[PDB]
Short mmCIF file of N, CA and C in Angstrom, two decimals:
data_model
loop_
_atom_site.label_atom_id
_atom_site.label_comp_id
_atom_site.label_asym_id
_atom_site.label_seq_id
_atom_site.Cartn_x
_atom_site.Cartn_y
_atom_site.Cartn_z
N UNK A 1 1.77 108.01 20.16
CA UNK A 1 1.69 109.43 19.82
C UNK A 1 1.82 109.58 18.31
N UNK A 2 0.74 110.01 17.66
CA UNK A 2 0.72 110.26 16.23
C UNK A 2 0.03 111.58 15.95
N UNK A 3 0.42 112.26 14.86
CA UNK A 3 -0.21 113.56 14.57
C UNK A 3 -1.71 113.48 14.35
N UNK A 4 -2.19 112.41 13.71
CA UNK A 4 -3.61 112.26 13.42
C UNK A 4 -4.00 110.80 13.57
N UNK A 5 -5.30 110.57 13.74
CA UNK A 5 -5.81 109.20 13.80
C UNK A 5 -5.62 108.50 12.46
N UNK A 6 -5.64 109.26 11.36
CA UNK A 6 -5.37 108.68 10.05
C UNK A 6 -3.97 108.10 9.99
N UNK A 7 -3.00 108.76 10.63
CA UNK A 7 -1.65 108.22 10.69
C UNK A 7 -1.61 106.90 11.44
N UNK A 8 -2.34 106.81 12.56
CA UNK A 8 -2.41 105.55 13.29
C UNK A 8 -3.03 104.45 12.44
N UNK A 9 -4.12 104.77 11.74
CA UNK A 9 -4.76 103.77 10.89
C UNK A 9 -3.84 103.31 9.78
N UNK A 10 -3.13 104.25 9.14
CA UNK A 10 -2.21 103.89 8.07
C UNK A 10 -1.08 103.01 8.59
N UNK A 11 -0.53 103.35 9.76
CA UNK A 11 0.54 102.54 10.34
C UNK A 11 0.05 101.14 10.68
N UNK A 12 -1.15 101.03 11.26
CA UNK A 12 -1.69 99.72 11.58
C UNK A 12 -1.94 98.90 10.33
N UNK A 13 -2.47 99.53 9.28
CA UNK A 13 -2.70 98.82 8.03
C UNK A 13 -1.39 98.35 7.40
N UNK A 14 -0.36 99.20 7.45
CA UNK A 14 0.94 98.81 6.92
C UNK A 14 1.53 97.64 7.70
N UNK A 15 1.41 97.68 9.03
CA UNK A 15 1.91 96.57 9.84
C UNK A 15 1.15 95.28 9.55
N UNK A 16 -0.17 95.37 9.37
CA UNK A 16 -0.95 94.19 9.04
C UNK A 16 -0.56 93.63 7.67
N UNK A 17 -0.33 94.52 6.70
CA UNK A 17 0.01 94.06 5.35
C UNK A 17 1.43 93.52 5.28
N UNK A 18 2.32 93.98 6.15
CA UNK A 18 3.69 93.50 6.13
C UNK A 18 3.76 92.01 6.43
N UNK A 19 2.97 91.54 7.40
CA UNK A 19 2.95 90.12 7.71
C UNK A 19 2.40 89.29 6.56
N UNK A 20 1.48 89.85 5.78
CA UNK A 20 0.89 89.15 4.67
C UNK A 20 -0.27 88.24 5.02
N UNK A 21 -0.61 88.12 6.31
CA UNK A 21 -1.72 87.27 6.70
C UNK A 21 -3.05 87.89 6.27
N UNK A 22 -3.21 89.19 6.48
CA UNK A 22 -4.44 89.90 6.13
C UNK A 22 -4.19 90.65 4.82
N UNK A 23 -4.84 90.27 3.72
CA UNK A 23 -4.66 90.99 2.46
C UNK A 23 -5.49 92.26 2.43
N UNK A 24 -4.83 93.40 2.55
CA UNK A 24 -5.46 94.71 2.48
C UNK A 24 -5.34 95.21 1.04
N UNK A 25 -6.45 95.56 0.38
CA UNK A 25 -6.35 95.99 -1.02
C UNK A 25 -5.63 97.32 -1.12
N UNK A 26 -4.95 97.58 -2.25
CA UNK A 26 -4.13 98.80 -2.35
C UNK A 26 -4.92 100.10 -2.19
N UNK A 27 -6.17 100.14 -2.65
CA UNK A 27 -6.93 101.38 -2.58
C UNK A 27 -7.20 101.80 -1.14
N UNK A 28 -7.46 100.82 -0.26
CA UNK A 28 -7.68 101.14 1.15
C UNK A 28 -6.42 101.74 1.76
N UNK A 29 -5.26 101.15 1.47
CA UNK A 29 -4.00 101.68 2.00
C UNK A 29 -3.72 103.07 1.46
N UNK A 30 -4.01 103.30 0.17
CA UNK A 30 -3.79 104.61 -0.42
C UNK A 30 -4.70 105.65 0.21
N UNK A 31 -5.95 105.28 0.48
CA UNK A 31 -6.90 106.23 1.06
C UNK A 31 -6.46 106.70 2.44
N UNK A 32 -5.69 105.88 3.16
CA UNK A 32 -5.22 106.22 4.50
C UNK A 32 -3.86 106.89 4.50
N UNK A 33 -3.24 107.08 3.34
CA UNK A 33 -1.91 107.67 3.27
C UNK A 33 -2.01 109.20 3.31
N UNK A 34 -0.86 109.85 3.18
CA UNK A 34 -0.77 111.31 3.19
C UNK A 34 -0.10 111.81 1.91
N UNK A 35 -0.51 111.25 0.77
CA UNK A 35 0.05 111.64 -0.52
C UNK A 35 -0.82 112.70 -1.18
N UNK A 36 -0.18 113.67 -1.82
CA UNK A 36 -0.92 114.77 -2.44
C UNK A 36 -1.68 114.31 -3.67
N UNK A 37 -1.12 113.37 -4.44
CA UNK A 37 -1.79 112.84 -5.62
C UNK A 37 -2.68 111.64 -5.30
N UNK A 38 -3.15 111.54 -4.05
CA UNK A 38 -4.08 110.46 -3.70
C UNK A 38 -5.32 110.43 -4.58
N UNK A 39 -5.99 111.55 -4.89
CA UNK A 39 -7.11 111.47 -5.84
C UNK A 39 -6.71 110.93 -7.20
N UNK A 40 -5.51 111.27 -7.68
CA UNK A 40 -5.05 110.76 -8.97
C UNK A 40 -4.89 109.24 -8.93
N UNK A 41 -4.27 108.73 -7.86
CA UNK A 41 -4.11 107.29 -7.72
C UNK A 41 -5.46 106.59 -7.60
N UNK A 42 -6.38 107.18 -6.84
CA UNK A 42 -7.71 106.59 -6.70
C UNK A 42 -8.43 106.53 -8.04
N UNK A 43 -8.38 107.62 -8.81
CA UNK A 43 -9.03 107.63 -10.12
C UNK A 43 -8.38 106.63 -11.07
N UNK A 44 -7.05 106.52 -11.03
CA UNK A 44 -6.37 105.59 -11.92
C UNK A 44 -6.63 104.14 -11.54
N UNK A 45 -6.83 103.86 -10.25
CA UNK A 45 -7.11 102.49 -9.83
C UNK A 45 -8.58 102.13 -10.00
N UNK A 46 -9.48 103.11 -9.96
CA UNK A 46 -10.91 102.82 -10.00
C UNK A 46 -11.42 102.50 -11.40
N UNK A 47 -10.69 102.89 -12.45
CA UNK A 47 -11.15 102.65 -13.81
C UNK A 47 -10.98 101.19 -14.19
N UNK A 48 -11.82 100.73 -15.11
CA UNK A 48 -11.84 99.34 -15.51
C UNK A 48 -10.83 99.03 -16.60
N UNK A 49 -11.05 97.93 -17.31
CA UNK A 49 -10.11 97.52 -18.36
C UNK A 49 -10.27 98.36 -19.62
N UNK A 50 -9.47 98.01 -20.62
CA UNK A 50 -9.45 98.74 -21.88
C UNK A 50 -10.74 98.49 -22.66
N UNK A 51 -10.83 99.11 -23.84
CA UNK A 51 -12.04 99.00 -24.65
C UNK A 51 -12.31 97.56 -25.09
N UNK A 52 -11.28 96.84 -25.54
CA UNK A 52 -11.46 95.48 -26.01
C UNK A 52 -11.31 94.45 -24.90
N UNK A 53 -10.57 94.78 -23.84
CA UNK A 53 -10.37 93.83 -22.75
C UNK A 53 -11.69 93.47 -22.08
N UNK A 54 -12.54 94.46 -21.84
CA UNK A 54 -13.85 94.17 -21.27
C UNK A 54 -14.75 93.48 -22.29
N UNK A 55 -14.72 93.92 -23.55
CA UNK A 55 -15.61 93.36 -24.56
C UNK A 55 -15.32 91.88 -24.79
N UNK A 56 -14.07 91.46 -24.60
CA UNK A 56 -13.72 90.05 -24.74
C UNK A 56 -14.54 89.18 -23.80
N UNK A 57 -14.98 89.73 -22.67
CA UNK A 57 -15.79 88.96 -21.73
C UNK A 57 -17.11 88.53 -22.36
N UNK A 58 -17.87 89.49 -22.92
CA UNK A 58 -19.12 89.11 -23.57
C UNK A 58 -18.87 88.34 -24.86
N UNK A 59 -17.73 88.58 -25.53
CA UNK A 59 -17.41 87.77 -26.71
C UNK A 59 -17.28 86.30 -26.32
N UNK A 60 -16.52 86.03 -25.26
CA UNK A 60 -16.36 84.65 -24.79
C UNK A 60 -17.67 84.08 -24.27
N UNK A 61 -18.47 84.90 -23.59
CA UNK A 61 -19.75 84.43 -23.08
C UNK A 61 -20.68 84.02 -24.22
N UNK A 62 -20.76 84.86 -25.26
CA UNK A 62 -21.57 84.53 -26.42
C UNK A 62 -21.03 83.29 -27.13
N UNK A 63 -19.70 83.17 -27.21
CA UNK A 63 -19.13 81.97 -27.81
C UNK A 63 -19.52 80.71 -27.06
N UNK A 64 -19.42 80.75 -25.73
CA UNK A 64 -19.78 79.58 -24.92
C UNK A 64 -21.26 79.25 -25.04
N UNK A 65 -22.12 80.28 -25.05
CA UNK A 65 -23.54 80.04 -25.27
C UNK A 65 -23.78 79.42 -26.64
N UNK A 66 -23.02 79.84 -27.64
CA UNK A 66 -23.13 79.23 -28.96
C UNK A 66 -22.71 77.77 -28.93
N UNK A 67 -21.66 77.44 -28.17
CA UNK A 67 -21.26 76.04 -28.05
C UNK A 67 -22.35 75.20 -27.38
N UNK A 68 -22.98 75.73 -26.33
CA UNK A 68 -24.03 74.95 -25.67
C UNK A 68 -25.24 74.80 -26.60
N UNK A 69 -25.53 75.83 -27.39
CA UNK A 69 -26.61 75.72 -28.37
C UNK A 69 -26.29 74.66 -29.43
N UNK A 70 -25.03 74.63 -29.88
CA UNK A 70 -24.62 73.61 -30.84
C UNK A 70 -24.72 72.21 -30.24
N UNK A 71 -24.36 72.07 -28.97
CA UNK A 71 -24.48 70.78 -28.31
C UNK A 71 -25.94 70.34 -28.22
N UNK A 72 -26.84 71.27 -27.88
CA UNK A 72 -28.27 70.93 -27.84
C UNK A 72 -28.78 70.56 -29.22
N UNK A 73 -28.33 71.27 -30.26
CA UNK A 73 -28.71 70.92 -31.62
C UNK A 73 -28.20 69.53 -31.99
N UNK A 74 -27.01 69.17 -31.51
CA UNK A 74 -26.50 67.82 -31.73
C UNK A 74 -27.36 66.78 -31.02
N UNK A 75 -27.82 67.10 -29.80
CA UNK A 75 -28.76 66.21 -29.12
C UNK A 75 -30.00 65.99 -29.98
N UNK A 76 -30.56 67.07 -30.51
CA UNK A 76 -31.73 66.95 -31.37
C UNK A 76 -31.46 66.13 -32.61
N UNK A 77 -30.29 66.33 -33.23
CA UNK A 77 -29.94 65.58 -34.43
C UNK A 77 -29.83 64.09 -34.13
N UNK A 78 -29.18 63.74 -33.02
CA UNK A 78 -29.05 62.33 -32.66
C UNK A 78 -30.41 61.71 -32.36
N UNK A 79 -31.28 62.46 -31.67
CA UNK A 79 -32.62 61.95 -31.38
C UNK A 79 -33.40 61.73 -32.67
N UNK A 80 -33.31 62.68 -33.60
CA UNK A 80 -34.02 62.55 -34.87
C UNK A 80 -33.49 61.36 -35.67
N UNK A 81 -32.17 61.15 -35.64
CA UNK A 81 -31.60 59.98 -36.31
C UNK A 81 -32.10 58.69 -35.68
N UNK A 82 -32.22 58.67 -34.35
CA UNK A 82 -32.76 57.50 -33.67
C UNK A 82 -34.19 57.22 -34.11
N UNK A 83 -35.02 58.27 -34.18
CA UNK A 83 -36.40 58.09 -34.63
C UNK A 83 -36.45 57.62 -36.07
N UNK A 84 -35.58 58.16 -36.93
CA UNK A 84 -35.56 57.72 -38.33
C UNK A 84 -35.16 56.26 -38.44
N UNK A 85 -34.17 55.83 -37.67
CA UNK A 85 -33.76 54.43 -37.69
C UNK A 85 -34.89 53.52 -37.20
N UNK A 86 -35.58 53.93 -36.13
CA UNK A 86 -36.70 53.13 -35.64
C UNK A 86 -37.82 53.05 -36.67
N UNK A 87 -38.11 54.16 -37.35
CA UNK A 87 -39.13 54.16 -38.39
C UNK A 87 -38.74 53.25 -39.54
N UNK A 88 -37.46 53.26 -39.92
CA UNK A 88 -36.99 52.36 -40.97
C UNK A 88 -37.12 50.91 -40.55
N UNK A 89 -36.84 50.61 -39.27
CA UNK A 89 -37.02 49.26 -38.76
C UNK A 89 -38.49 48.85 -38.86
N UNK A 90 -39.39 49.75 -38.44
CA UNK A 90 -40.81 49.43 -38.45
C UNK A 90 -41.33 49.23 -39.87
N UNK A 91 -40.85 50.04 -40.82
CA UNK A 91 -41.33 49.94 -42.20
C UNK A 91 -41.00 48.58 -42.81
N UNK A 92 -39.79 48.09 -42.57
CA UNK A 92 -39.37 46.81 -43.12
C UNK A 92 -39.18 45.77 -42.01
N UNK B 1 -2.10 91.67 30.23
CA UNK B 1 -2.71 92.99 30.32
C UNK B 1 -3.09 93.48 28.93
N UNK B 2 -4.39 93.55 28.66
CA UNK B 2 -4.91 94.03 27.39
C UNK B 2 -5.96 95.09 27.64
N UNK B 3 -6.12 96.04 26.71
CA UNK B 3 -7.14 97.09 26.91
C UNK B 3 -8.55 96.54 26.93
N UNK B 4 -8.94 95.78 25.91
CA UNK B 4 -10.25 95.16 25.84
C UNK B 4 -10.09 93.67 25.63
N UNK B 5 -11.20 92.95 25.77
CA UNK B 5 -11.21 91.52 25.46
C UNK B 5 -10.97 91.31 23.97
N UNK B 6 -11.51 92.19 23.13
CA UNK B 6 -11.34 92.05 21.69
C UNK B 6 -9.89 92.20 21.27
N UNK B 7 -9.13 93.08 21.94
CA UNK B 7 -7.73 93.26 21.58
C UNK B 7 -6.92 92.00 21.83
N UNK B 8 -7.07 91.41 23.02
CA UNK B 8 -6.38 90.16 23.32
C UNK B 8 -6.86 89.03 22.42
N UNK B 9 -8.16 89.00 22.11
CA UNK B 9 -8.70 87.99 21.21
C UNK B 9 -8.06 88.09 19.82
N UNK B 10 -7.94 89.32 19.30
CA UNK B 10 -7.31 89.52 18.00
C UNK B 10 -5.83 89.16 18.05
N UNK B 11 -5.15 89.48 19.16
CA UNK B 11 -3.75 89.11 19.29
C UNK B 11 -3.58 87.59 19.27
N UNK B 12 -4.46 86.88 19.98
CA UNK B 12 -4.41 85.42 19.97
C UNK B 12 -4.69 84.87 18.58
N UNK B 13 -5.66 85.45 17.88
CA UNK B 13 -5.96 85.01 16.52
C UNK B 13 -4.77 85.22 15.60
N UNK B 14 -4.10 86.37 15.71
CA UNK B 14 -2.92 86.63 14.89
C UNK B 14 -1.79 85.67 15.22
N UNK B 15 -1.59 85.38 16.51
CA UNK B 15 -0.56 84.42 16.90
C UNK B 15 -0.86 83.03 16.34
N UNK B 16 -2.13 82.62 16.39
CA UNK B 16 -2.50 81.32 15.83
C UNK B 16 -2.30 81.28 14.32
N UNK B 17 -2.68 82.35 13.63
CA UNK B 17 -2.54 82.39 12.18
C UNK B 17 -1.09 82.49 11.73
N UNK B 18 -0.21 83.03 12.57
CA UNK B 18 1.20 83.15 12.20
C UNK B 18 1.83 81.78 11.99
N UNK B 19 1.45 80.80 12.81
CA UNK B 19 1.99 79.45 12.66
C UNK B 19 1.60 78.85 11.31
N UNK B 20 0.36 79.07 10.89
CA UNK B 20 -0.12 78.58 9.61
C UNK B 20 -0.68 77.18 9.63
N UNK B 21 -0.59 76.47 10.76
CA UNK B 21 -1.17 75.14 10.85
C UNK B 21 -2.68 75.20 10.71
N UNK B 22 -3.31 76.14 11.42
CA UNK B 22 -4.75 76.35 11.36
C UNK B 22 -5.01 77.48 10.36
N UNK B 23 -5.84 77.27 9.34
CA UNK B 23 -6.12 78.33 8.36
C UNK B 23 -7.19 79.27 8.89
N UNK B 24 -6.79 80.50 9.17
CA UNK B 24 -7.69 81.53 9.69
C UNK B 24 -8.07 82.46 8.55
N UNK B 25 -9.36 82.63 8.24
CA UNK B 25 -9.73 83.47 7.11
C UNK B 25 -9.57 84.94 7.45
N UNK B 26 -9.31 85.80 6.46
CA UNK B 26 -9.06 87.22 6.75
C UNK B 26 -10.23 87.94 7.40
N UNK B 27 -11.47 87.61 7.02
CA UNK B 27 -12.62 88.37 7.49
C UNK B 27 -12.74 88.31 9.00
N UNK B 28 -12.47 87.15 9.59
CA UNK B 28 -12.49 87.03 11.05
C UNK B 28 -11.43 87.94 11.66
N UNK B 29 -10.25 88.00 11.04
CA UNK B 29 -9.18 88.85 11.57
C UNK B 29 -9.58 90.32 11.53
N UNK B 30 -10.17 90.78 10.42
CA UNK B 30 -10.59 92.18 10.36
C UNK B 30 -11.73 92.45 11.33
N UNK B 31 -12.63 91.48 11.51
CA UNK B 31 -13.72 91.66 12.47
C UNK B 31 -13.18 91.80 13.88
N UNK B 32 -12.18 90.99 14.24
CA UNK B 32 -11.58 91.08 15.57
C UNK B 32 -10.63 92.27 15.71
N UNK B 33 -10.15 92.82 14.60
CA UNK B 33 -9.21 93.93 14.65
C UNK B 33 -9.92 95.22 15.03
N UNK B 34 -9.15 96.16 15.57
CA UNK B 34 -9.67 97.47 15.97
C UNK B 34 -9.21 98.51 14.95
N UNK B 35 -10.00 98.64 13.88
CA UNK B 35 -9.73 99.60 12.82
C UNK B 35 -11.00 100.36 12.49
N UNK B 36 -10.83 101.63 12.10
CA UNK B 36 -11.98 102.44 11.73
C UNK B 36 -12.51 102.06 10.35
N UNK B 37 -11.64 101.58 9.46
CA UNK B 37 -12.05 101.12 8.14
C UNK B 37 -12.56 99.68 8.15
N UNK B 38 -12.87 99.14 9.33
CA UNK B 38 -13.35 97.76 9.41
C UNK B 38 -14.62 97.51 8.61
N UNK B 39 -15.67 98.34 8.69
CA UNK B 39 -16.85 98.07 7.85
C UNK B 39 -16.55 98.06 6.36
N UNK B 40 -15.68 98.96 5.89
CA UNK B 40 -15.38 99.00 4.47
C UNK B 40 -14.63 97.75 4.02
N UNK B 41 -13.63 97.32 4.80
CA UNK B 41 -12.91 96.10 4.46
C UNK B 41 -13.83 94.89 4.51
N UNK B 42 -14.71 94.83 5.51
CA UNK B 42 -15.64 93.71 5.60
C UNK B 42 -16.59 93.67 4.41
N UNK B 43 -17.09 94.83 3.99
CA UNK B 43 -17.95 94.88 2.81
C UNK B 43 -17.19 94.48 1.55
N UNK B 44 -15.94 94.93 1.42
CA UNK B 44 -15.14 94.58 0.25
C UNK B 44 -14.87 93.08 0.18
N UNK B 45 -14.53 92.47 1.32
CA UNK B 45 -14.22 91.04 1.32
C UNK B 45 -15.48 90.20 1.17
N UNK B 46 -16.59 90.62 1.77
CA UNK B 46 -17.83 89.87 1.73
C UNK B 46 -18.71 90.23 0.53
N UNK B 47 -18.23 91.08 -0.37
CA UNK B 47 -19.02 91.46 -1.53
C UNK B 47 -19.27 90.24 -2.42
N UNK B 48 -20.45 90.22 -3.04
CA UNK B 48 -20.83 89.13 -3.90
C UNK B 48 -20.01 89.09 -5.17
N UNK B 49 -19.92 87.91 -5.79
CA UNK B 49 -19.17 87.79 -7.04
C UNK B 49 -19.83 88.60 -8.15
N UNK B 50 -19.00 89.09 -9.07
CA UNK B 50 -19.50 89.85 -10.20
C UNK B 50 -20.36 88.97 -11.10
N UNK B 51 -21.31 89.60 -11.78
CA UNK B 51 -22.28 88.86 -12.59
C UNK B 51 -21.60 88.14 -13.76
N UNK B 52 -20.45 88.63 -14.21
CA UNK B 52 -19.79 88.04 -15.37
C UNK B 52 -19.35 86.61 -15.11
N UNK B 53 -18.64 86.37 -14.00
CA UNK B 53 -18.18 85.01 -13.74
C UNK B 53 -19.33 84.11 -13.29
N UNK B 54 -20.38 84.67 -12.69
CA UNK B 54 -21.57 83.88 -12.40
C UNK B 54 -22.22 83.39 -13.69
N UNK B 55 -22.33 84.27 -14.68
CA UNK B 55 -22.85 83.87 -15.99
C UNK B 55 -21.94 82.83 -16.63
N UNK B 56 -20.62 83.01 -16.52
CA UNK B 56 -19.69 82.04 -17.08
C UNK B 56 -19.87 80.67 -16.45
N UNK B 57 -20.02 80.63 -15.12
CA UNK B 57 -20.22 79.36 -14.43
C UNK B 57 -21.55 78.71 -14.83
N UNK B 58 -22.61 79.51 -14.95
CA UNK B 58 -23.90 78.95 -15.34
C UNK B 58 -23.86 78.42 -16.77
N UNK B 59 -23.13 79.10 -17.66
CA UNK B 59 -22.99 78.60 -19.03
C UNK B 59 -22.14 77.34 -19.05
N UNK B 60 -21.12 77.25 -18.19
CA UNK B 60 -20.35 76.01 -18.10
C UNK B 60 -21.22 74.85 -17.64
N UNK B 61 -22.07 75.08 -16.64
CA UNK B 61 -22.98 74.03 -16.19
C UNK B 61 -23.96 73.64 -17.28
N UNK B 62 -24.49 74.63 -18.01
CA UNK B 62 -25.40 74.33 -19.11
C UNK B 62 -24.70 73.53 -20.20
N UNK B 63 -23.43 73.85 -20.48
CA UNK B 63 -22.68 73.10 -21.47
C UNK B 63 -22.42 71.67 -21.04
N UNK B 64 -22.12 71.47 -19.75
CA UNK B 64 -21.96 70.11 -19.24
C UNK B 64 -23.26 69.32 -19.36
N UNK B 65 -24.39 69.95 -19.03
CA UNK B 65 -25.68 69.28 -19.18
C UNK B 65 -25.96 68.95 -20.64
N UNK B 66 -25.66 69.88 -21.55
CA UNK B 66 -25.87 69.63 -22.97
C UNK B 66 -24.98 68.51 -23.47
N UNK B 67 -23.74 68.44 -22.99
CA UNK B 67 -22.85 67.35 -23.36
C UNK B 67 -23.40 66.01 -22.88
N UNK B 68 -23.93 65.98 -21.66
CA UNK B 68 -24.53 64.75 -21.14
C UNK B 68 -25.73 64.34 -22.00
N UNK B 69 -26.56 65.32 -22.37
CA UNK B 69 -27.72 65.02 -23.22
C UNK B 69 -27.29 64.50 -24.59
N UNK B 70 -26.25 65.10 -25.16
CA UNK B 70 -25.73 64.63 -26.45
C UNK B 70 -25.21 63.21 -26.33
N UNK B 71 -24.53 62.90 -25.22
CA UNK B 71 -24.06 61.54 -24.98
C UNK B 71 -25.22 60.55 -24.90
N UNK B 72 -26.27 60.90 -24.16
CA UNK B 72 -27.41 59.99 -24.04
C UNK B 72 -28.09 59.78 -25.39
N UNK B 73 -28.24 60.85 -26.17
CA UNK B 73 -28.84 60.71 -27.49
C UNK B 73 -27.97 59.87 -28.41
N UNK B 74 -26.64 60.02 -28.32
CA UNK B 74 -25.74 59.19 -29.11
C UNK B 74 -25.85 57.72 -28.72
N UNK B 75 -25.95 57.44 -27.42
CA UNK B 75 -26.12 56.06 -26.98
C UNK B 75 -27.43 55.48 -27.49
N UNK B 76 -28.51 56.26 -27.44
CA UNK B 76 -29.77 55.80 -27.99
C UNK B 76 -29.69 55.54 -29.49
N UNK B 77 -28.99 56.42 -30.21
CA UNK B 77 -28.80 56.22 -31.64
C UNK B 77 -28.02 54.94 -31.92
N UNK B 78 -26.98 54.68 -31.12
CA UNK B 78 -26.20 53.46 -31.30
C UNK B 78 -27.05 52.22 -31.03
N UNK B 79 -27.88 52.27 -29.99
CA UNK B 79 -28.77 51.14 -29.69
C UNK B 79 -29.75 50.92 -30.84
N UNK B 80 -30.31 52.01 -31.37
CA UNK B 80 -31.23 51.89 -32.50
C UNK B 80 -30.53 51.32 -33.73
N UNK B 81 -29.28 51.73 -33.97
CA UNK B 81 -28.52 51.19 -35.09
C UNK B 81 -28.26 49.70 -34.91
N UNK B 82 -27.95 49.28 -33.69
CA UNK B 82 -27.78 47.86 -33.41
C UNK B 82 -29.07 47.09 -33.68
N UNK B 83 -30.21 47.64 -33.25
CA UNK B 83 -31.49 46.99 -33.50
C UNK B 83 -31.78 46.92 -34.99
N UNK B 84 -31.45 47.97 -35.74
CA UNK B 84 -31.66 47.97 -37.18
C UNK B 84 -30.79 46.92 -37.86
N UNK B 85 -29.54 46.79 -37.42
CA UNK B 85 -28.67 45.76 -37.97
C UNK B 85 -29.22 44.37 -37.68
N UNK B 86 -29.71 44.15 -36.46
CA UNK B 86 -30.30 42.85 -36.12
C UNK B 86 -31.53 42.57 -36.97
N UNK B 87 -32.37 43.58 -37.18
CA UNK B 87 -33.56 43.41 -38.02
C UNK B 87 -33.17 43.08 -39.46
N UNK B 88 -32.15 43.75 -39.98
CA UNK B 88 -31.66 43.43 -41.32
C UNK B 88 -31.10 42.02 -41.39
N UNK B 89 -30.49 41.55 -40.29
CA UNK B 89 -30.05 40.16 -40.23
C UNK B 89 -31.24 39.22 -40.31
N UNK B 90 -32.30 39.53 -39.57
CA UNK B 90 -33.46 38.64 -39.51
C UNK B 90 -34.28 38.63 -40.80
N UNK B 91 -34.20 39.69 -41.60
CA UNK B 91 -34.99 39.78 -42.83
C UNK B 91 -34.31 39.13 -44.02
N UNK B 92 -33.10 38.61 -43.85
CA UNK B 92 -32.38 37.96 -44.95
C UNK B 92 -32.41 36.44 -44.79
#
C-alpha cells in the first residue's frame, strides 16, 4: 500500500541501491523522489564541467596528436639518415 | 509462490549475485527486474562511450604504432651504420 506508483518505484530503487549490487545513478533516484527542488537538483546535475575543465580535454588530445606527429617525423628522420648512410657507402 | 516467472527469476539472480562468487552484470538484473524506469536505466547503462575517450584511445593506438615505426627506422639506421663502418674498414 503506497500513495502513488512513484512512491513504490522510489522505494524499490532505494532498496536496490542499498545492497549496492545494482548501481542506480543519482539522477534516476532523484527523478523518482518527492522533493520540491527536484528541478533544481536535475539542472545542477545535468550541467557539464567548468570552462577550463572541459577545454583541458581537447588540449590533451591536441598534445597527444602532436606527440604522434613528432614520432612520425622521427621515423622519417631515421629513414632519411639510413638513406644518407647508404648513399655515402655507395659513393665510396 | 511468485507472481510471475520473471519475479522469481530476478529473485534467484539477486540471491546468486549476493554471494559474489559468480559476477552478475547490472544490465541483466535491471532487465529481469520489474521497474517502470527499466528502459531508461537500460539505455543509460548500454549507452555508447563518449567520443572524447574514443579519440583518446585511437590517438594512443596511433602513438604506439608511430613508436613501433620509429623503432624499426632506428634499427635500420643502426644496421646501415654498421654496414658503413664495415665498408670504411674494407677501404683502408
